[PDB]
Every structure is written in structure tokens, then in C-alpha cells.
């Protein structure tokens, strides 16, 4: 069957640059036209290059032209794409799709963050109280978990998309709608190794 | 470049329903147009190629029509998994664009939200900043405006709203309306006021309180 296996992006900060990948297999590699498509944070899909199977030329959208490169290994079945001068706008899920313009196999999504931020784990404040929850401020990069009394309570539970704030930092509220017991707010920042356990008191 | 015009941009609707999904090419695309189906932490998924040509492994109640500049798409009797955003995507030339994408999302009764203040933690204000936050939870449709009074000052550049997906159980949405403030700042002023606008409140609902 069609596959395409994508590599691992990466963390960068403006003007940097990374390189991510695709190893196809179960088609005609060597002859087929392969292309990058873009998607950011609550934007739409969008279109970033595409390599030609029979002749290697290449095609890429202006806002990438003499940025990023895309390349291919015929030997190894390797798409790549060679993300140079990274920019904020940069930030995306990444998929290495089969064809030109007809998209029927797409690689898992690779994300690319691009930001002049440095890890932080996030400062967990209580939203007192009916409704209480917490506050998850100030943390990078994405993502974070938030779970109630270690994952008991798991009803009621709106725990809000993270918002990129003006400071470059991220930030999401947790909230629960209790009746009339404690509750503790359980949250997780893998990129900086951080677990906060957070009780909400009235 | 080719514009990619979509319509609608959210389509209320529900399960069982056969619904028609319209894409506008700014010039001539001929055929050459795709449809794509995408659901959050999925990767898109084809749905119709060449304009009308039902994509290979696309369910059978995806349809296809048009040609020029004015394309369709239709989904006879929608599934649940049917409610994601739909693009449309000409690759008749170079760059090849896709629309900004139609919404399908639930349709259900109207709801008013149930709107809720808090202000800042003591602990938060020991750190040189201060946020208020202001819920509306479980409302229909998703339309909500939320307005933020300083000591009867409307507020501009220093709120952020985020707001969550449809309710798997009620099909409603939560929203989450934050206000910045410097620690200074906040103690400059008294009322803090969170003024919601609904299709469900007869009368705007202001949720307040005092420093
Ligand atoms: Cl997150
Ligand atoms: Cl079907």
C-alpha cells in the first residue's frame, strides 16, 4: 500500500533552520511528483512546493521561494524539505502528500514551531469559586495537560485551546461546573519536564 | 495567483442531511479542482479530483460538480464524521491555492450562555501582572460577542478569546474571554464588567465585580 512515513520537526527560532522528511514506499517513487502542504494554527490548508518525479524541477509558493528547498533520494525513497531563514509565520503541521495537485496519501503531519521564545513551564493561579477551574499561563512551547484529581473527575471539564499570547508565552484555562470534596488541577509540561498540582479553594 | 473563494463559511446543519458545499475560481481552473475533508489531529482526506471525479477510496456519498470559475460539492445523507471543514483546491496552474475553507458544523436550538467573572489570584498579582477572566459556557450558535469595561471604559488590544469545539454530547460551545492587565494597572481601577451579547439573551448580561 501507499505509505509515507514522516520524520520528526523541531523547535526553531527565527532565521534558523530545519530539515524534515518522508520515506515513501508501496508506489513509483522515482517517477512521481511529490508536494509539501502547509497548515497553521486556525488557518487553512496551504500549498508550500512540489518536486517533479520525471525531471526533479520544482515548484514553491512566494512566501517560501529561496527559503525552503525541496529535494528528493530516489536510492532511499526520501522527500525532503529544507526549511532555511525560519520565520514566525513559519509555524505549521507539515504533510509530504503523494502527487502534484490530486492528494490522495498524506504523510502524518510534522510540526514546526518557529519562535524566539525559550521553554518555560507554565505558573498555574486557581479560578475560584458553580464554576472554578485553573489558569495555565505563561508556558512554551505547546503542549500542556490538564487533568482534575488525577484524572477522577472527568465530566463537566472544559479545558480551553491553548491561545498564543502577545508575549510570544501560551495560555489556556481549565474549568469545571461542580455541585454545591476537593479539587485539584493536575497539569503537565513535557518540553520543560514541569508538574504542577494546583487545589482550587473558595 | 488564483483565488479560491468558499461558501458558506459555516454551514449549520444535521446528521441524515444531503448538503451542497460551493467554490469560486477568481479566473478559468477548467476541471482541474479537489475537495478535501479535515478533521482536527487527522491528516486531510480527498474527497472529489477533476471536478467531478469522486476520489478512489472517498466514501460513495461525496459528489462533485462544476467547471470554469463556480465548482460544488455535495454529501448525500452526512454522517457525524461528516462535521469537519471542507477546502477546495485548483491545480490547474502554479501556485496551486486552495480555498479558506467551509465549517459543517451541528445544528441544534439556540442556548444562552451561562456567564461567570474571576479576577485575579493573590498568588498571580505577587508576579507584576493580573488576569481577569470571564466564561460563557455551553451556548448555541457559537456567535458571541464579549465586551470588557474598565470603571465604565471599553477595552481594546488586551483580551484574547478562545473557544472550544462542539459539545460531543449537547453540541454547544464554551468560550473563555481573558483581560491583561499590569499589576499597576489593575490597581488603578474598581469595576471590572463582562458584558455578553447573544442571539440567546434578550438583554445583554454584564457579570462584574469590585477590586
Ligand atoms: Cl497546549
Ligand atoms: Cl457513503
Redesign the interface.
Known sequence: QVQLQHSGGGLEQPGGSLRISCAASGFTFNTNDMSWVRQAPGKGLQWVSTIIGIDDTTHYADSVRGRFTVSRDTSKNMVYLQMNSLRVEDTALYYCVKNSGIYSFWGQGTLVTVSSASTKGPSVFPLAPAALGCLVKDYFPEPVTVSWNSGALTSGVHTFPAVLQSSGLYSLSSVVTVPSQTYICNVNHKPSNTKVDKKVEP | DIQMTQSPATLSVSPGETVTLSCRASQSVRT?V?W?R?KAGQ????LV??ASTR???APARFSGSGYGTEFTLTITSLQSEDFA?Y?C?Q?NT????????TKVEVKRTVAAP?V?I?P??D??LK?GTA?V?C?L?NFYPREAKVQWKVDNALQSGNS?????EQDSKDSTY?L?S?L?LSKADYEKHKVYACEVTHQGLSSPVTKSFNR
Open positions: 482541474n479537489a478535501y479535515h491528516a486531510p482526506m480527498i479530483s477533476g476520489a478512489s477510496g471543514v477546502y483546491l491545480y502554479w501556485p496551486r491555492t486552495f480555498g479558506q475553507g451561562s461567570f474571576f485575579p489570584s498568588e498571580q508576579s488576569s477572566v466564561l459556557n484574547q478569546e478562545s473557544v472550544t464554551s473563555s481573558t491583561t
